[PDB]
């Protein structure tokens, strides 16, 4: 069973954005960094420039430019996983699937998420990593992984960092 | 199973219009560019001039000189794919399909469409893209995908651009 | 006297004006392009092209006599001849030929044309096909022309409808 | 192998431009002067009214009417070459050729230039002068003499002058 592409490449659509302007953008989807390859293949660059007393900023990859994937059958052995170096390391954010639902009233698109923290330590270094789909996926909140649409970043801590990334897909068995 | 090629390297029969003549022809189809190559062959130029208060303009590319293809099979799995470049980067508009139907009375070509911005950014710059059949080619609002007519471009935002194109097929595989 | 030529276009391209609503018209650095893949007597063409359909109802070339300045024409008016040859894309294709000219008394117009359907002096073929335009009939409706003070010549739409065509060694002549 | 006329004799398209207006145009060519010959031929006339405090004046004359020529073979052993009277003498700046590749990053046309000084001082007298291209279109500047579009007459003393041209060309082989 097949494989998922979040990113490989070239840049994803989708939204990405910030109270004042704190996170750097590109036509509103994350900047694609070429400068700063790995693995023959170029990054996604998550800039957060300055320092947001905002209190916020977010970012929507999409899976299927803004449409529902169904992933149940991913959930119960599948993994977000992707790799990861810093700007200067022990950096911290969230991260997630929202999904839509129309049915739904406390909520139309949900959000579940971690902090990536739980899954690494980050190094001024590339690091691969894989977040079981299980752990988020399950939380009777509401949340209809048959019905994702994209993937998330959002602010924890309001201070300034980078980080890069390769290769974000989602795989199972 | 086939390819079909909506457009290689050489000007398709068609109809490509403005209100105010907006968008850059050549006798009513897209202007060919040579002057801008990619990969061996010359491109499509989609190109819109200046700011339309008008509120339209129009491509369609069209798949059997006007004539009905049946695409039936290839939904399913297949992919509008193609190659685009564009000026000055993250510009939008639609694209999709027509058909034709005569026993169909709330309409007589109905069009299919979304807006590239969801499958792709645009860069200065080539890049591959791939469209997906199956999502367009389903919801209820009538279309029969085993008579299509042709492909279309139309007005999204009212903003000058011009974009780019190679290399535009359908494939699918069984 | 025993009277000299004026090329208006041999080989090489005009400084001028040439341009289009829409951008219709076939311009580069708004002089008519030059065509060398299309040659005629050993020497390149001029290509009057209006690629597509004109919405905006106007196109317009101007070629220049003298850089844009006043060239006096007056001694070959009553004798005299535009002339020239053209092949065209496809056939029968019409519009506007003749000139303009600046007078800076005159206040009903600085600048005036003077102005023939080639029609009349052509039909037009798929082939080469010189021709002779008397100055004589133009530079004569009392409407002020003053053909001691032409600036250049003109091209501008006729018919709404896209054609190419060919143009080379435009001159004028008399005796 | 053939000529190459830049001028003869009648004005050349192209675009020859100043600040507040210093330089002498005529629909943004420069000037044929009729009334100062030279063997039989009329004349190009580059003059600069007066003294440039902008900082800038520019011409050029194309070749191809902004078309691409290839040039290409005349190089190792060409010459830009044509004659030349001033005012009154001593009076200098640039010269050169253009061009155009668009693949190319970092710059899309250039220029390639010498100052008419190297190859003359300058006579209330007519004079003829034989540039090497050799010696220009030789910078790993990345100059494309394939492409050239074309030649350049560019500001390099601020102070006013005059002079004329006869005859340029390309020659060669």
Redesign the interface.
């Known amino acids: 069973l097949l494989d998922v592409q979040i990113f490989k490449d070239?840049?994803?659509?989708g939204w990405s954005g910030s109270g004042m302007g704190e996170l750097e953008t590109?036509?509103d989807?994350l900047p694609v960094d070429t400068t700063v390859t790995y693995n023959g293949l170029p990054t996604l660059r998550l800039n957060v420039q300055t320092t947001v007393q905002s209190g916020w900023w977010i970012s929507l990859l999409?899976l299927?430019?803004?449409?529902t994937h169904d992933l149940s059958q991913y959930v119960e052995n599948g993994y977000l996983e992707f790799d990861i170096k810093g700007k200067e390391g022990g950096e911290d954010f969230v991260i997630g699937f929202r999904d839509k639902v129309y049915e739904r009233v406390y909520g139309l698109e949900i959000d579940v998420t971690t902090v990536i923290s739980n899954y690494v330590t980050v190094t001024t270094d590339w690091q691969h990593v894989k977040i079981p789909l299980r752990d988020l996926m399950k939380i009777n909140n509401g949340f209809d992984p048959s019905s994702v649409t994209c993937l998330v970043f959002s602010k924890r801590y309001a201070d300034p960092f980078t980080v890069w990334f390769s290769d974000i897909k989602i795989t199972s068995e």
Chains 1, 4 share one sequence.
């Open positions: 070239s840049p994803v659509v590109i036509g989807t999409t299927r430019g803004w449409n």
